[PDB]
Design a protein around this ligand. Structure first.
Ligand SMILES: Cc1nc(=O)c(C)n[nH]1
Length: 148
């Protein structure tokens, strides 16, 4: 899948989900919510983008050993929400997402990609809302898209 090899715009973030049930709910309802600090980071990136390129999210459940898919941010963060929707009751907030890949990709396939903005650590050792440089994100996206 040579599609992503020539991407010229966009920002890309890691999402770490404590719960696979929350991944299921995100796919069913096309929504996500991060922590307070994570929501602020994603909101800033989405808003400054002003629709000039995509914001992609690379999802992985904590401790699972694999990534589980890719979604595009499709709205700014709405902070005026009901509590208790997600795996920890305190998280409020919501933004729309569109899932573009739902597939398990082992960390072994992605570990060789290092993030020069994060001490050259493997992309598989990232924390929630770690940003991925575009040239490294393109390599992750090609691998996820091509994996079978
Ligand atoms: C739904 C959800 N799970 C999480 O573990 C985090 C960090 N943010 N949002």
């Amino acid at each position: 899948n040579l599609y992503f090899q020539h991407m010229k715009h966009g920002r890309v973030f890691i999402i770490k989900s404590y719960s696979e049930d929350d991944i299921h709910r995100s796919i069913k309802y096309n929504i996500w919510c991060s922590t307070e600090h994570g929501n602020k980071r994603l909101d800033a990136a989405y808003r400054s983008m002003n629709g000039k390129g995509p914001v992609y999210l690379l999802f992985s459940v904590n401790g699972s050993g694999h990534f589980c898919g890719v979604a595009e941010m499709k709205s700014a963060v709405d902070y005026n929400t009901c509590a208790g929707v997600w795996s920890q009751d305190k998280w409020k907030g919501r933004f729309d997402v569109r899932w573009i890949f739902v597939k398990d990709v082992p960390n072994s396939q992605l570990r060789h990609i290092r993030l020069e903005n994060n001490e050259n650590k493997p992309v598989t050792n990232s924390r929630d809302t770690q940003e991925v440089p575009l040239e490294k994100a393109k390599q992750v996206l090609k691998i996820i898209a091509s994996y079978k």
